[PDB]
Scaffold this active site. Sequence first.
Site, PDB file in Angstrom:
ATOM      1  N   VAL A  57     -46.869  88.899  34.500  1.00 60.21           N
ATOM      2  CA  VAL A  57     -48.247  88.657  34.897  1.00 60.21           C
ATOM      3  C   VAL A  57     -48.373  88.698  36.425  1.00 60.21           C
ATOM      4  CG1 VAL A  57     -50.250  87.024  34.710  1.00 60.21           C
ATOM      5  CG2 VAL A  57     -48.581  87.212  32.813  1.00 60.21           C
ATOM      6  N   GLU A  62     -47.562  88.280  44.680  1.00 58.86           N
ATOM      7  CA  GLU A  62     -46.595  89.366  44.687  1.00 58.86           C
ATOM      8  C   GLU A  62     -46.758  90.400  45.796  1.00 58.86           C
ATOM      9  OE1 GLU A  62     -48.690  88.717  42.019  1.00 58.86           O
ATOM     10  OE2 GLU A  62     -47.507  88.481  40.249  1.00 58.86           O
ATOM     11  N   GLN A 174     -26.691  87.333  31.605  1.00 61.90           N
ATOM     12  CA  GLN A 174     -27.157  88.694  31.831  1.00 61.90           C
ATOM     13  C   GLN A 174     -28.656  88.735  32.178  1.00 61.90           C
ATOM     14  OE1 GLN A 174     -29.608  91.557  30.399  1.00 61.90           O
ATOM     15  NE2 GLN A 174     -27.604  92.380  30.830  1.00 61.90           N
ATOM     16  N   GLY A 175     -28.894  89.474  33.242  1.00 66.50           N
ATOM     17  CA  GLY A 175     -30.215  89.580  33.801  1.00 66.50           C
ATOM     18  C   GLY A 175     -30.347  88.749  35.060  1.00 66.50           C
ATOM     19  N   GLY A 178     -26.908  89.746  40.455  1.00 73.36           N
ATOM     20  CA  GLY A 178     -27.419  90.041  41.795  1.00 73.36           C
ATOM     21  C   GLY A 178     -28.181  88.910  42.485  1.00 73.36           C
TER      22      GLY A 178
HETATM   23  N1  LIG Z   1     -21.882  83.635  32.842  1.00 69.62           N
HETATM   24  C1  LIG Z   1     -21.771  84.377  34.050  1.00 69.62           C
HETATM   25  C2  LIG Z   1     -22.457  85.718  33.923  1.00 69.62           C
HETATM   26  C3  LIG Z   1     -23.344  86.096  34.899  1.00 69.62           C
HETATM   27  C4  LIG Z   1     -23.985  87.318  34.841  1.00 69.62           C
HETATM   28  C5  LIG Z   1     -23.726  88.158  33.774  1.00 69.62           C
HETATM   29  F1  LIG Z   1     -24.348  89.399  33.723  1.00 69.62           F
HETATM   30  C6  LIG Z   1     -22.836  87.786  32.774  1.00 69.62           C
HETATM   31  C7  LIG Z   1     -22.199  86.562  32.862  1.00 69.62           C
HETATM   32 CA   LIG Z   2     -46.019  88.250  38.544  1.00 71.07          CA
END
Ligand SMILES: [NH3+]Cc1ccc(F)cc1
Ligand SMILES: [Ca+2]
Length: 223
Positions: A57, A62, A174-175, A178
């Site tokens: 949204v 932003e 995951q996600g 970075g």
């Molecule tokens: N549990 C640590 C972790 C961090 C990022 C990722 F993509 C996978 C595992």
């Molecule tokens: Ca937004």
Amino acid sequence: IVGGYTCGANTVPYQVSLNSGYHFCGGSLINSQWVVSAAHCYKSGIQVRLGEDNINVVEGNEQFISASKSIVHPSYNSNTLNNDIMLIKLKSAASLNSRVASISLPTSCASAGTQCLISGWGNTKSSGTSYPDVLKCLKAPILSDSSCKSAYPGQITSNMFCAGYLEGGKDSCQGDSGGPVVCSGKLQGIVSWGSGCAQKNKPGVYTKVCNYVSWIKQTIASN
Ligand SMILES: [NH3+]Cc1ccc(F)cc1
Ligand SMILES: [Ca+2]
């Protein structure tokens, strides 16, 4: 983030979302024209999204700025994840305010026991999947290097630290890749890798940003 809390809109103002038609990685704004992220997040066609809380949204704070150049660390090894760090230059400078702010680079490496804030829009489940639309936050300590090396035999280099909970239940996931690990107002880590998420004796592994401060500074002085 597994086992964390909702940060609150724009309370982590250096948090960026990297978007290539969808959110795929987090990152950190270190000045008005440069972002640091994980080298394993590298992609061509990156748009940087600043001032985000709900990533689905448009809420009013932003700034969507496209990347003009990306620089993966010259010694990044994708097999071991050593030197998992990348710099992204924005096409134009971000407009900085209370909600869009850069984070400081460290002048000292942080010690084991230091409490830190890890944040991102990644998976919130240890088994199965569910992605939040709003930013999640987790407070976790940096772990000692001997418990880090005991958790991941033969895999931790001097460019990595572990942070989190050997009991499990709370972790990045995951996600969240970075994204920032901020300790005492300084960027100390970059969400890098781990063995699954929030598992017992498998804490998150983070790129140690204090080892890279002079490569970052000379690279942004020359590009
Ligand atoms: N549990 C640590 C972790 C961090 C990022 C990722 F993509 C996978 C595992
Ligand atoms: Ca937004």
